[PDB]
Design a protein around this ligand. Structure first.
Ligand code: HEM
Ligand SMILES: N[C@@H](Cc1c[nH]c2ccccc12)C(=O)O
Ligand SMILES: OCCc1c[nH]c2ccccc12
Ligand SMILES: [C-]#N
Length: 381
């Protein structure tokens, strides 16, 4: 079965739509000139003075996902505004109704998710040149000097690097079924190599994303309205819903690729009934329908951990541990990123636990997730 996985990019949208049809030019002009409109402070006036447009004219899947990115970026720009404190609790019917109808059609929440701002928000400058940062550029930004290009593309490049292991997954379960030791050993080491390579692509974040520019500018526009003191009851969608509704902000916890390795290796991140387990499970509803199907498809298969444990095979245990060590390394490095990009900039701000964009007590959350990964290390059985 097909889960919209590409051979070249993985779970990213393969060469996404760059521009909407002529009927939706009113939405496109607002989203493209978004840094200018916020800085002037005239964004909120133009969204209110807009016409309610029907979503029927959107032809294909690539167009529909771009429209989610267009309307999603505008919604975040309308709510947070300049990003200082003054917020809009109400989203006008002219934008709220078409966005909710598109969200329901694509089985996604009416909020900017990872699939919009990362997986669909990219273009390559030269089509003949291979996929690299210097050849790539984002489609939409929130502000000037907010490091949108560096942040969204590095996240995408790590996604693509790790997605090289997705093609190895069919080999893993076939080797278990056919009872093929040498094949499974080579397959697991290949996955471990991909995750080690993804860590090297991660290093690029320091070059292209500024710590102060991320925290005080860009981070506010990725934040949502679930477990948020600024929008306590949430957001009222005028015309569509009767009561204010809570929805979580964007995170890479909404990525299928990164959740899939925990599932493949039998790292029970979603089990336990804890706050960390609850978040990662809830974020699957913030993923595309096809990507959600892939995750439980992996859960439906025999456990790789249980297979390797029963064998009494030092080489097969080592190859399995190589994957787990690679995931620990990525999560240890991610926490170092958190120190540089959240923790240190937060202490520099002028006049109790810190919360992420997704809506978690981040330091306790991320360490629990890493601890669960560390516990999965076999260490000679
Ligand atoms: C600007 C740099 C980054 C910061 C400050 C950051 C911070 C965080 C925070 C606070 C969370 C907790 C969830 C939430 O409340 O939002 C989180 C989760 C996560 N981040 Fe990041 N992150 C960054 C970049 C990345 C990148 C580039 C990746 C990989 C492409 C990544 C992968 C993840 C994953 C997979 C999770 C879910 C928890 C887990 O499985 O470990 N992050 N991040
Ligand atoms: N969760 C991060 C922001 C973030 C990192 N990667 C993302 C991908 C998509 C949306 C948001 C993000 C924070 O709280 O600072
Ligand atoms: O939180 C660290 C980022 C991360 C978790 N799982 C992954 C799999 C591949 C690449 C990065 C990650
Ligand atoms: C990273 N969220």
């Amino acid at each position: 079965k097909e889960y919209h996985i590409d051979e070249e990019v993985g779970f990213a949208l393969p060469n996404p739509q760059e521009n909407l049809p002529d009927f939706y030019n009113d939405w496109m002009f607002i989203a493209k000139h978004l840094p200018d409109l916020i800085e002037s402070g005239q964004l909120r006036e133009r969204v209110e003075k807009l016409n309610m447009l029907s979503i029927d004219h959107l032809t294909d899947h690539k167009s529909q996902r771009l429209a989610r990115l267009v309307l999603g970026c505008i919604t975040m720009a309308y709510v947070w505004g300049k990003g200082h404190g003054d917020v809009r609790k109400v989203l006008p019917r002219n934008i709220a109704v078409p966005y909710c109808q598109l969200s329901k059609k694509l089985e996604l929440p009416p909020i900017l998710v990872y699939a919009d701002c990362v997986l669909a928000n990219w273009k390559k400058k030269d089509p003949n040149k291979p996929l690299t940062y210097e050849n790539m550029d984002v489609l939409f930004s929130f502000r000037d000097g907010d490091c949108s290009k560096g942040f969204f593309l590095v996240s995408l490049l790590v996604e693509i690097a790790a997605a090289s292991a997705i093609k190895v997954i069919p080999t893993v379960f076939k080797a278990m079924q056919m009872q093929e030791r040498d094949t499974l050993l080579k397959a697991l080491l290949e996955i471990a190599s991909c995750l080690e390579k993804a860590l090297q692509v991660f290093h690029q974040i320091h070059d292209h994303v500024n710590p102060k520019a991320f925290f005080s500018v860009l981070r506010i526009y990725l934040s949502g309205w679930k477990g948020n003191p600024q929008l306590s009851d949430g957001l009222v969608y005028e015309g569509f819903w009767e009561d204010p509704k809570e929805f979580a902000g964007g995170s890479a916890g909404q990525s299928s690729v990164f959740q899939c390795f925990d599932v493949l290796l039998g790292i029970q991140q979603t089990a336990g009934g804890g706050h960390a387990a609850q978040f990662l499970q809830d974020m699957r509803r913030y993923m595309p329908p096809a990507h959600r199907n892939f995750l439980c498809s992996l859960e439906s298969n025999p456990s790789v951990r249980e297979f390797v444990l029963s064998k009494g095979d030092a080489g097969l245990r080592e190859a399995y541990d190589a994957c787990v060590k690679a995931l620990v390394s990525l999560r240890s490095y991610h926490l170092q990123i958190v120190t540089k990009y959240i923790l240190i900039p937060a202490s520099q701000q002028p006049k109790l636990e810190a919360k992420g964009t997704g809506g978690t007590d981040l330091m306790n959350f991320l360490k629990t997730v890493r601890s669960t990964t560390e516990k999965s290390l076999l260490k000679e059985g």
